[PDB]
């Protein structure tokens, strides 16, 4: 498995428009694109409010927040058993593959992802804040 | 009627019965011994 | 960003990763000196701080801990 | 392109993609009479910089408040500038103790 | 049962504005396009002058007819015009400091016109453009307040 | 056929074994308590029948039988009121002298000195002066005896037993199937034609035959013991013909369409009876006949089992336009499949109806000697206004519950609901703007006037003297309704109300109703009302439209309708739930209706209510609403502080209970602030430090003490807030108006 | 909305016959004299009041003028007739029945 490049020629679900879609944030800093392949034309709920019809085959959707994309991801996986992957798109044109970063979904293991932010102590084994006092920035003993 | 008497032994029913009893006892004490400001009898 | 630490009481139940609405956590093999899996937090720059992960952690005390740090556009969950 | 067959995402058109549109702007150069435009480009020539405009605003506002307190409030015939015109509530301190 | 009116914005159902009669009726679009705010090729100082004339002329009325000296015959108009001059001055100050605060990041994405052709950014939305716009607003607003007084004095049917 | 009786036979065994197992209805509560949160959840989930099961049949059966229980309880309550009027009343004394005797139907036992509440109400009677209007209602029905009230009480108890039997029967013995509940066409046909049509027709008949003659003799000075009993009027047509000559002709003028012959007892007089200050019962009888015919024709509108009628699905699916897409497509399924949608609509209209009732019963007093019983009038207005506000907030709540639970995007594609959710941002933005605009241009007017009056500039206020904000539209409508019998309602003899204009009706020296003049203060307070209403709508509609998702939380429907938060993240998501939007809409409904009823009380006591001592009306407060209601300090001084002199000086009187409840409602209100201003995390730690002391002495309970949930903390807080505020206003109003009126 | 890519400019499908026909369907019945108006008509009395209030042009009508009743009723019926005519015409041309 390798990082898939976002195909921009992907169609979009049938949606009549809303007011919960993109804002100036998409034009300024970043927005999000979620893609999935549907087996049949089905009506799903938009996280922005409203009902859209996903097309048979590949479907592309734009969102201004990662939580929107993962809400739709969990809806498509739990109510439709699809396998969506979403990206972070910048106004520069730079696309950053995000969700199945390893290819598999993070609730399952893929044998090759490296563990991060794992404290190898108990949560009651943290030092007192008097030990991390004057650490430059204001810090928690968990570091 | 084992289940009915189990229902009557529930916390709200027992509380209602016990507090009706306590309030009635206090009310009858205050009817027959009215205005007890001090222990003098 | 918010600080999401994971401690060595993790039992690999994967419920923290299932419950994260931002894909901040994942399950890594054999970093904890434990059974098969241990939880990780490689994407804490996307963490909003909902603490849905540590609402779903069954260990006592929590094996996943979210310490609310400095706010950003992603941490504050802004579509604008 | 971007409108072809419900393809609302284009990497070569990020303006249409993100909704970066001028919904009502028109770039026509011709609006005003050129003598009027000259008059008003020259009237603002001195204050067309931030520092100059804030200097004008400071000068005008400070002068205005100072002349309003010195002269303008009395010209407006404000009650605070006329005075009580009466003995006031002087000897009526309280209902019980009529204090000065 | 054809002919629906409300459409997504520029046909994009995921941007979220929902073009609508109040938004995109040709009379409304025309009127809003002809306003000096949306004359993106015209110099910001002159658009500011027009906007300021309009606003200084309009916001004198309330101060004249509803102010604290509204019941004094010849003093109502003077006091209201001066209150409006002060408010215009404050607004020019606010415009200046807005131009100082806002225009530092220089956005990089381009603009289009709901038709496909990319246009240049409004010079108004720069430091120099907004500074000259605020200068024009001050000049035009004080001029419009003075003209509001002049109209109090010369209009036949002014009450 | 499609519309038929369909029931399951003996679906549920009548047994006490589930009484002995608390929490049987839930799978999460059947496991027994380990914490006290279980004890609270057992009561929060008791009537959430759609969370017990998920099939609509058992839900609907539970709902039907619970409605039967509610009706049985209402019947117990009505029979109790009639019985207390038959046994513990001064009603027979009040009939003979209703202008001097205070209605009382509750006697207090002399136990702890509380026999002081048994006040001198009149009629050789000692009791609590009631404010329910039951005496006037009974006199309108033509009771004239305690025996009739006693037998009405017995009938009410019989009907309550019938209702409880019917609930048991329609749940346990023969419970209707789902297809029986989904016959909304037949339900509407029967509820319009039968419940409202036959009901109004039967009441019209009672009024033709019992109320009108009895009250015509009562208004003629006849003592109630000399009046013929209703059955003597039913049997003897000669007595009725002596009272109303049209009865000599029989029912022939009805079938010959010579209906004008019945103009003796079917009138269009309008206005008020000058003897009683209430509506003409002939007008009322004609009214009920008319609306009976109207509802009986309305109940023949929907298609049930024969070809004639309408399919509501067709009406809906045909009503669509260029702006609304598919239109009302998919709403028939919503309203035949979701109980919460029906409850939303029905509570909305029922509360609006209760408020309309409040506004229409004070202006057109329908009962004799009701308008001059100022306490009854004020209490009825206040009561029905409050009930309406509560019902409306519940409509918001259950619309949100529908949106969370029963909403399906498959059945709603490009229909009105989808299109409302799709531009909710515009709706709520414009509602927010109008709320802010109204708040400014309503309350800032009061602030401007307070500032000007404090600064010594009354000529700069928004008053009827300085800067008049005259409600000219309402004044025009007043003048138009006043002049209606002249041009636009020529067969009416007088206007519907005296509030439009004209002369006053004085009954017993007191003003029954008199023209209400609208001025600048009325403008300001009506815009205050509009403001508070718009903000309540804002909160509740925002909870409805943002119940499933938001820009903050896109998966809010999965968290549920009733959840505390999502977390301290995204800056903090406290009270994003729709339940919390109901929780806040309750505060704002309270703040709205408090001003509504304050406006009513002050306007009535200043410009309507009062005495006619000489030729000239002396109002209660003296007509100070016009000049003092311009400021907040006027409402504080001339209404709250002034009119509190009767509730705080009531100690040692029969109104001392009102002062006691005033203070106690203040206490409860402030006590609500411990639950509203605080959070669960302090109280759980305090509870565990107390549980330490219980464990030390071996009295630590097995049901672990928990703090109230966040949602329950908020619910307790708002409940105590509403109770305290409303009971404070209740005591203040009643102690004031029983004394001064 | 698979259609409606550009907010069609002819959002109101204008028929110039619609305003004329609504005006004539309302004002002609509104020119029928009836018993309640004293033999006069609603449009007749409305125009009579328009004349009586144009006789002092600056001074607007009073609250007790009866010009407002005629105004509001006439325009209720007229706006209703015009909008229902537009709706009916554009439903006849389109589907909707
Ligand atoms: C904590 C504060 C407080 C205190 C100390 C009191 C104290 C008192 N109140 Mg006040 N009161 C309070 C709060 C308080 N009250 C509140 C909040 C309210 C409003 C609800 C009232 C309202 C109120 C009223 C309206 C009245 C009182 C009265 C009284 C007196 C009651 C005397 C009595 O009943 O003798 C009872 C005597 C006993 C001996 C009973 C003791 C209990 C048992 C029976 C003893 C055990 C015997 C034996 C072992 C039992 C064997 C087993 C049994 C099952 C057979 C007393 C001075 C009354 C009074 O006269 O005051 C002057 C009165 O009329 N109070
Ligand atoms: C909404 C229903 C309702 C309410 C709130 C009341 C309230 C009251 N009733 Mg009434 N009552 C009702 C329905 C109601 N009643 C009905 C339906 C009947 C007919 C069966 C009666 C018949 C009745 C009688 C015969 C008497 C009351 C009495 C009372 C008072 C004291 C009751 C008591 O001490 O309970 C005690 C409760 C327990 C011990 C438990 C109280 C004001 C008494 C009263 O007012 O005396 C002056 C009294 O003697 N009630
Ligand atoms: C003695 C007769 C009887 C018996 C044995 C049962 C037995 C049963 N019923 Mg049935 N039922 C009956 C009468 C009876 N019912 C009647 C008369 C009605 C009509 C209202 C119903 C309506 C009904 C429904 C709709 C449901 C049941 C259910 C049940 C089951 C458990 C109910 C439970 O937990 O009870 C304990 C509950 C109570 C004791 C609560 C009673 C509340 C009453 C009705 C209202 C009182 C309000 C009160 C005045 C408020 C005062 C406030 C206070 C502050 C003063 C069980 C099979 C439920 C079930 O799941 O069955 C499978 C169910 O959903 N029943
Ligand atoms: C003329 C026929 C008729 C009448 C009078 C009613 C009347 C009523 N229905 Mg409706 N209903 C009808 C036909 C009718 N229904 C049909 C055909 C259906 C099937 C589609 C339904 C389905 C239905 C549901 C699903 C519900 C009601 C409810 C109600 C009650 C609402 C509360 C109210 O207004 O209190 C007014 C109270 C009174 C007027 C008191 C008198 C009550 C009398 C005794 C009952 C009415 C006669 C009854 C319908 C016929 C059977 C008689 C019985 C002896 C067998 C009300 C009593 C609601 C309710 O509260 O349920 C209990 C409810 O949830 N009904
Ligand atoms: C539901 C409403 C209602 C009811 C019940 C009545 C009832 C009555 N009206 Mg009233 N009335 C009403 C509405 C009503 N009215 C309205 C709305 C108006 C205005 C138009 C009037 C105007 C009006 C006038 C002007 C008069 C009446 C009269 C009457 C009486 C004569 C009935 C009659 O001749 O009709 C005929 C009715 C029937 C034939 C039905 C009787 C059927 C019986 C009950 C069958 C039962 C037999 C059973 C199966 C076997 C025996 C049982 C057992 C012994 C074995 C009767 C008491 C007249 C009168 O004398 O009043 C004192 C009269 O002059 N009414
Ligand atoms: C026709 C009226 C009606 C009906 C049938 C329902 C029915 C329902 N509502 Mg709705 N609701 C209504 C009116 C109605 N409500 C109104 C008017 C409001 C605004 C206040 C609400 C607000 C509301 C909310 C906010 C919620 C519901 C919920 C529910 C469901 C469960 C309620 C429950 O288990 O409570 C059982 C009963 C109790 C817990 C008792 C409450 C006692 C109150 C708080 C105290 C007041 C008592 C008294 C008046 C004060 C004096 C008492 C004295 C002792 C001091 C159920 C479907 C809940 C739901 O569906 O959850 C998903 C939910 O979250 N409703
Ligand atoms: C262009 C037409 C026009 C003009 C110049 C005026 C001008 C005026 N009107 Mg008139 N008015 C008009 C149209 C007009 N109105 C219309 C269409 C209506 C409806 C009114 C209703 C109206 C009322 C009700 C009142 C005025 C009043 C006034 C005066 C103060 C405002 C001012 C002379 C006020 C006045 O001075 O008297 C006043 O009370 N006007
Ligand atoms: C549009 C907003 C217009 C509001 C005008 C207003 O409310 O004036 C409100 C003031 C009210 O003026 C006050 O009225 C009170 C009435 O009791 C006082 O008694 C005094 O007359 C006076 O203080 O009207 C005027 O004095 C100015 C009249 C001219 C109105 C200007 C309209 C501007 C054109 C608007 C459309 C473009
Ligand atoms: C009240 C003002 C409503 C204004 C009005 O006249 O709207 C009327 C307009 C009529 O829409 P349609 O004719 O398409 O509706 C057909 C009906 O059967 C509903 O589907 O409703 C809308 O466009 C949506 C609501 C807009 C709400 C705008 C609020 C301002
Ligand atoms: C108050 C009360 C009470 C009582 C009540 C009552 C007493 C009621 C009654 C009721 C009634 C008593 C009713 C009746 C009814 C009747 C009717 C409703 C009738 C009808 C008729 C008709 C509709 C007709 C038709 C027709 C004609 C017209 C002619 C011929 C043909 C025909 C038949 C078709 C009680 C106790 C419960 C308690 C609670 C409260
Ligand atoms: C005071 C308070 C508490 C503490 C309140 C406690 C836990 C509830 C107390 C209810 C009663 C007193 C306990 C019931 C015990 C028995 C049922 C009573 C029977 C015996 C009696 C005679 C004593 C909270 O848990 C809380 C949570 C969230 C926001 C605000 C608050 C809050 O303000
Ligand atoms: S952190 Fe907690 S929830 Fe997540 S895998 Fe480890 S034990 Fe399970």
Curated annotation (Swiss-Prot), chain A:
It is a peripheral membrane protein. GO terms for biological process: photosynthesis. It comes from the Eukaryota. Keywords: Chloroplast, Membrane, Photosynthesis, Photosystem I, Plastid, Thylakoid, Transit peptide. It is found in: Plastid, Chloroplast thylakoid membrane. The keyword Transit peptide applies. GO terms for cellular component: chloroplast thylakoid membrane; photosystem I reaction center. PsaD can form complexes with ferredoxin and ferredoxin-oxidoreductase in photosystem I (PS I) reaction center. PSAD may encode the ferredoxin-docking protein. Belongs to the PsaD family. This is Photosystem I reaction center subunit II, chloroplastic. It comes from Chlamydomonas reinhardtii (Chlamydomonas smithii). The gene is psaD. The chain holds residues 53 to 195 of 196 of the full protein.
Curated annotation (Swiss-Prot), chain B:
It is found in: Plastid, Chloroplast thylakoid membrane. The keyword DNA-binding does not apply. Signal peptide: none annotated. It is a single-pass membrane protein. One of its GO terms (cellular component) is photosystem I. GO terms for biological process: photosynthesis. This is Photosystem I reaction center subunit IX. It comes from Chlamydomonas reinhardtii (Chlamydomonas smithii). The gene is psaJ.
From Swiss-Prot, chain D:
The keyword Transmembrane applies. GO terms for biological process: photosynthesis. It is found in: Plastid, Chloroplast thylakoid membrane. Residues 75-100 are annotated as: Disordered. It is a single-pass membrane protein. GO terms for cellular component: chloroplast thylakoid membrane; photosystem I reaction center. It comes from the Eukaryota. Keywords: Chloroplast, Membrane, Photosynthesis, Photosystem I, Plastid, Thylakoid, Transit peptide, Transmembrane, Transmembrane helix. The keyword Iron does not apply. The chain crosses the membrane at residues 55-73. Possible role could be the docking of the LHC I antenna complex to the core complex. Belongs to the psaH family. This is Photosystem I reaction center subunit VI, chloroplastic. It comes from Chlamydomonas reinhardtii. The chain holds residues 31 to 130 of 130 of the full protein.
Swiss-Prot record, chain F:
It is found in: Plastid, Chloroplast thylakoid membrane. Its EC number is 1.97.1.12. The chain crosses the membrane at residues 63-86, 149-172, 188-212, 284-302, 339-362, 378-404, 426-448, 523-541, 581-602, 655-677, 715-735. It is a multi-pass membrane protein. GO terms for biological process: photosynthesis. Keywords: 4Fe-4S, Chlorophyll, Chloroplast, Chromophore, Electron transport, Iron, Iron-sulfur, Magnesium, Membrane, Metal-binding, Oxidoreductase, Photosynthesis, Photosystem I, Plastid, Thylakoid, Transmembrane, Transmembrane helix, Transport. Phylloquinone binds at residue 683. One of its GO terms (cellular component) is chloroplast thylakoid membrane. The keyword Disulfide bond does not apply. [4Fe-4S] cluster binds at residues 565, 574. Pfam families: PsaA_PsaB. The keyword Magnesium applies. Chlorophyll a binds at residues 674, 682. Signal peptide: none annotated. Chlorophyll a' binds at residue 666. P700 is a chlorophyll a/chlorophyll a' dimer, A0 is one or more chlorophyll a, A1 is one or both phylloquinones and FX is a shared 4Fe-4S iron-sulfur center. It catalyses: reduced [plastocyanin] + hnu + oxidized [2Fe-2S]-[ferredoxin] = oxidized [plastocyanin] + reduced [2Fe-2S]-[ferredoxin]. One of its GO terms (molecular function) is magnesium ion binding. It comes from the Eukaryota. NCBIfam families: psaA (TIGR01335). The PsaA/B heterodimer binds the P700 chlorophyll special pair and subsequent electron acceptors. PSI consists of a core antenna complex that captures photons, and an electron transfer chain that converts photonic excitation into a charge separation. The eukaryotic PSI reaction center is composed of at least 11 subunits. Belongs to the PsaA/PsaB family. This is Photosystem I P700 chlorophyll a apoprotein A1.
């Amino acid at each position: 498995w390798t990082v898939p490049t976002l195909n921009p020629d992907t169609p979009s679900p049938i949606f009549g428009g809303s007011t919960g879609g993109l804002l100036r944030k998409a034009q300024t800093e970043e927005f999000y694109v979620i893609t999935w392949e549907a087996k049949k034309e089905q009506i799903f709920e938009m996280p922005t409010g409203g009902a859209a019809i996903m097309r048979q085959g590949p479907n592309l959707l734009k969102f201004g927040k990662k939580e929107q994309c993962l809400a739709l991801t969990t809806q498509l996986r739990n109510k439709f058993k699809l396998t969506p992957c979403f990206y972070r798109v910048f106004p520069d044109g730079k696309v950053q593959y995000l969700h199945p970063a390893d290819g598999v979904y993070p609730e399952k293991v893929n044998a090759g992802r490296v563990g991060a932010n794992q404290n190898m102590r108990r949560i009651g084994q943290n030092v007192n804040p008097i030990k991390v006092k004057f650490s430059g920035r204001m810090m928690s003993p968990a570091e | 009627m084992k289940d009915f008497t189990t229902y009557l032994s529930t916390a709200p029913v027992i509380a209602t019965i016990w507090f009706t009893f306590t309030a009635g006892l206090l009310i009858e004490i205050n009817r027959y011994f009215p205005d007890p400001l001090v222990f003098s009898f | 960003a918010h600080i999401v630490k994971i401690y060595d009481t993790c039992i690999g139940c994967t419920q923290c990763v299932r419950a994260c609405p931002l894909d901040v956590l994942e399950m890594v093999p054999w970093d904890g000196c434990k059974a098969s899996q241990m939880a990780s937090a490689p994407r804490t720059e996307d963490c909003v701080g909902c603490k849905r992960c540590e609402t779903a952690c069954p260990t006592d005390f929590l094996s996943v801990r979210v310490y609310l740090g400095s706010e950003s556009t992603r941490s504050m969950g802004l579509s604008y | 392109k971007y409108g072809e067959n419900s393809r609302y995402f284009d990497l070569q058109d990020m303006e249409n993609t993100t909704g970066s549109w001028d919904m009502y702007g028109v770039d026509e150069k011709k609006r005003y009479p050129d003598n009027q435009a000259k008059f008003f480009t020259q009237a603002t020539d001195i204050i067309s910089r931030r520092e100059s405009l804030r200097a004008l605003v400071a000068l005008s506002g400070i002068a205005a408040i100072v002349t309003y307190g010195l002269k303008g409030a009395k010209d407006a015939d404000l009650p605070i500038t006329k005075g009580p015109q009466t003995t006031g509530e002087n000897g009526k301190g309280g209902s019980v103790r009529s204090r000065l | 049962k054809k002919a629906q009116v409300i459409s997504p914005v520029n046909g994009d159902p995921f941007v979220g504005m929902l073009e609508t009669p109040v938004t995109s009726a040709p009379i409304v679009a025309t009127y809003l396009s002809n306003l000096p705010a949306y004359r993106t090729g015209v110099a910001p100082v002159l658009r500011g002058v027009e906007i300021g004339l309009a606003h200084g002329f309009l916001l004198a009325g309330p101060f004249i007819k509803l102010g604290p000296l509204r019941n004094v015959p010849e003093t109502a108009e003077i006091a209201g015009s001066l209150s409006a001059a002060g408010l215009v001055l404050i607004l020019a100050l606010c415009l200046s400091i807005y131009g100082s605060a806002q225009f530092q990041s220089t956005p990089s994405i381009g603009v289009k016109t709901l038709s496909g052709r990319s246009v240049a950014r409004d010079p108004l939305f720069s430091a120099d453009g907004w500074s000259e716009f605020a200068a024009g607003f001050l000049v035009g607003g004080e001029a419009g307040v003075a003209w509001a007084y002049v109209c109090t004095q010369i209009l036949p049917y002014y009450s | 056929k499609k519309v038929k009786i369909a029931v399951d036979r003996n679906p549920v065994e009548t047994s006490f074994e589930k009484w002995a197992k608390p929490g049987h209805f839930s799978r999460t509560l059947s496991k027994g308590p380990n914490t006290t949160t279980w004890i609270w959840n057992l009561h929060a989930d008791a009537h959430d029948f759609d969370s017990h099961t998920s099939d609509l049949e058992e839900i609907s059966r539970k709902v039907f039988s619970a409605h039967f229980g509610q009706l049985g309880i209402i019947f117990i309550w009505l029979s109790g009121m009639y019985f207390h009027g038959a046994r513990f009343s001064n009603y027979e004394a009040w009939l003979s002298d209703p202008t001097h005797i205070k209605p009382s139907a509750q006697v207090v036992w002399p136990i702890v000195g509380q026999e002081i509440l048994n006040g001198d109400v009149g009629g050789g009677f000692q009791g609590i002066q009631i404010t329910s209007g039951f005496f006037q209602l009974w006199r309108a029905s033509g009771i004239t005896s305690e025996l009739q009230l006693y037998t009405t009480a017995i009938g009410g108890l019989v009907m309550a037993a019938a209702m409880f039997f019917a609930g048991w029967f329609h749940y346990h013995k023969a419970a209707p199937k789902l297809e029986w509940f989904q016959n909304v066409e037949s339900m509407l046909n029967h509820h319009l034609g039968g419940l409202l049509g036959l009901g109004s027709l039967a009441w019209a008949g009672h009024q033709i035959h019992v109320s009108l003659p009895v009250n015509k003799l009562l208004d003629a000075g006849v003592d109630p013991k000399e009046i013929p009993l209703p059955h003597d009027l039913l049997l003897n047509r000669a007595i009725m013909a002596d009272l109303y000559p049209s009865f000599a002709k029989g029912i022939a003028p009805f079938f010959t369409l010579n209906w004008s012959e019945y103009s003796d007892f079917l009138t269009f007089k309008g206005g008020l009876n000058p003897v009683t200050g209430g509506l003409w019962l002939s007008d009322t009888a004609h009214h009920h006949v008319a609306i009976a015919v109207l509802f009986l024709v309305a109940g023949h509108m929907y298609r049930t089992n024969w070809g004639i009628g309408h399919s509501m699905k067709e009406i809906l699916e045909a009503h669509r336009g260029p702006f609304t897409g598919e239109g009302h497509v998919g709403l028939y399924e919503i309203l035949t499949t979701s109980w919460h949608a029906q409850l939303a609509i029905n509570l909305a209209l029922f509360g609006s109806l209760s408020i309309i009732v409040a506004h229409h019963m004070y202006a057109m007093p329908p009962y004799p000697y009701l308008a001059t019983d100022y306490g009854t009038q004020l209490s009825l207005f206040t009561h029905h206004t409050w009930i309406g506000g509560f019902c409306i907030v519940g409509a918001g709540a259950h619309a949100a519950i529908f949106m969370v639970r029963d909403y399906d995007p498959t059945n709603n594609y490009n229909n009105l609901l989808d299109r409302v959710i799709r531009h909710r941002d515009a709706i709520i933005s414009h509602l927010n703007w109008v709320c802010i605009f109204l708040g400014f241009h309503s309350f800032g007017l009061y602030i401007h006037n307070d500032t000007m009056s404090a600064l010594g500039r009354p000529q700069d206020m928004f008053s009827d003297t300085a800067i008049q904000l005259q409600p000219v539209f309402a004044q025009w409508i007043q003048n138009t309704h006043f002049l209606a019998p002249q041009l636009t309602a020529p067969n009416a003899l007088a206007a519907t109300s005296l509030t439009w204009g004209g002369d006053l009706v004085a009954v017993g020296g007191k003003v029954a109703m008199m023209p209400i003049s609208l001025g600048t203060s009325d403008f300001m307070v009506h815009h205050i009302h509009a403001f508070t209403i718009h903000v309540t709508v804002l909160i509740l509609l925002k909870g409805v439209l943002f119940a499933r998702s938001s820009r903050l939380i896109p998966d809010k429907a999965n968290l549920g309708f009733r959840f505390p938060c999502d977390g301290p993240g995204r800056g903090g998501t406290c009270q994003v739930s729709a339940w919390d939007h109901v929780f806040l809409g309750l505060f704002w409904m309270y703040n709205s209706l408090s001003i509504v009823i304050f406006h009513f009380s002050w306007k009535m006591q200043s410009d309507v209510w009062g005495t006619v001592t000489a030729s000239g009306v002396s109002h209660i407060t003296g007509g100070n609403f016009a000049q003092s209601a311009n400021t907040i300090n006027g409402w504080l001084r001339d209404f709250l502080w002034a009119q509190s002199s009767q509730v705080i000086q009531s100690y040692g009187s029969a109104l001392s209970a009102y002062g006691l409840i005033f203070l106690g409602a203040h206490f409860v209100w402030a006590f609500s602030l411990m639950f509203l201003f605080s959070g669960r995390g302090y109280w759980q730690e305090l509870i565990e430090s107390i549980v330490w002391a219980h464990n030390k002495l071996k009295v630590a309970p097995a049901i672990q003490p928990r703090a109230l949930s966040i949602t329950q903390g908020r619910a307790v807080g708002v409940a105590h807030y509403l109770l305290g505020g409303i009971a404070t206003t209740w005591s203040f109003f009643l102690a004031r108006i029983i004394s001064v009126g | 909305e698979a259609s409606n890519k550009s907010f069609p400019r002819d959002w109101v499908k204008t028929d110039p016959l619609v305003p004329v026909l609504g005006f004539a369907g309302w004002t002609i019945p509104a020119n029928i004299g009836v018993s309640a108006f004293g033999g006069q008509s609603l449009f007749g009395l409305f125009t009579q009041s328009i004349g009586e209030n144009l006789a002092h042009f600056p001074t607007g009508p009073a609250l007790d003028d009866k010009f407002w009743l005629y105004l509001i009723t006439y325009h209720l019926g007229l706006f209703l007739t015009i909008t229902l005519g537009q709706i009916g015409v554009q439903g006849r041309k389109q589907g909707y029945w």
